[PDB]
Design a protein around this ligand. Structure first.
Ligand SMILES: O=C(CCc1c[nH]c2ccccc12)NS(=O)(=O)OC[C@H]1O[C@@H](n2cnc3c2ncn2ccnc32)[C@H](O)[C@@H]1O
Lengths: 115, 111
C-alpha cells in the first residue's frame, strides 16, 4: 500500500483520521496529537522513506519541499513570531514513527538546547 | 552580512566538516551535544520564512549533507536536526542554518 503501514501511511491514505492543514501530491501536513507547543504540526512526504539517514540523493527536492510547506503552513497558522522545525533520527533522536517527517512547533518561546 | 558569511568567505576560522559549491558544514562554536554541527547554504537566505519554492532543492541538500556528515561523524545511534525561525524559534544568526545534534539522548520536548 502506497505510503506504507506506519500510522503516517494510514493517515496519508485517510484510513486513520487526522486534522489536515495542507495536502498536495508530494506531502501532507497535519496537527500532532501530543503537541509540545501551542501549535505543533507535522509535514510528511507521501513517499515512504523510513528515516532521514536512508534518504537518497534524489530525495533532496522532496525533503526541501517539506520545509517549504512547513514554513507556508506556519505562516497560514499565524506563527508570526517564529517557530522551530525538527527532524528526529533513530533512538538518540527519539524517533517513534519510522516514516520521515518534519515537526513544526510554535506559539511559545522555544528554549535551548532543543532537547 | 553575518558571522556565517565571514565563515563562508574564510575570513574567520571554523572547524569545517564538509564543503561543496552550494553549502558548508562546520562544528557549532557553542555545542549542546557531544556532536553538534551546522549546515548552511552559501546563498544568503536570512531565515526559512523567506525561502522561495526555487530553494527547495537547496534546502533538501542541506538535510542530505547533514545526514551524510552525521554518518561520517559516527552518529550511528541517531541524531536531531533543527532549524530555528525568528524570536520564538530562538534563531540566533539570520542566515539559514540546519543544526545537527547527536552523541547523547535528545529529549522531548525539543526545547
Ligand atoms: O516521537 C518522537 C519524539 C517523541 C518522544 C517521546 N519520548 C521521547 C524521548 C526523547 C526524545 C523524543 C521523544 N519522534 S517522532 O519524530 O517520531 O515524532 C512522531 C510524532 O508523531 C505524532 N503522532 C503519532 N500518531 C499521530 C501523531 N500525530 C498526529 N496524528 C493523527 C493521528 N495519529 C497521529 C507523535 O505525537 C509525535 O509527535
Amino acid at each position: 500500500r502506497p505510503g506504507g503501514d506506519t500510522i503516517f501511511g494510514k493517515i496519508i491514505r485517510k484510513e486513520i483520521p487526522a486534522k489536515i492543514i495542507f495536502e498536495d501530491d508530494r506531502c501532507l501536513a497535519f496537527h500532532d496529537i501530543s503537541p509540545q507547543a501551542p501549535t505543533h504540526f507535522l509535514v510528511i512526504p507521501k513517499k515512504h522513506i523510513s528515516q532521514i539517514s536512508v534518504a537518497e540523493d534524489d530525495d533532496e527536492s522532496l525533503l526541501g519541499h517539506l520545509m517549504i510547506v512547513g514554513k507556508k503552513c506556519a505562516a497560514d497558522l499565524g506563527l508570526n513570531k517564529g517557530y522551530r522545525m525538527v527532524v528526529n533520527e533513530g533512538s538518540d533522536g527519539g524517533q517513534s514513527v519510522y516514516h520521515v517527517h518534519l515537526h513544526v512547533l510554535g506559539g511559545r518561546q522555544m528554549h535551548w538546547p532543543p532537547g
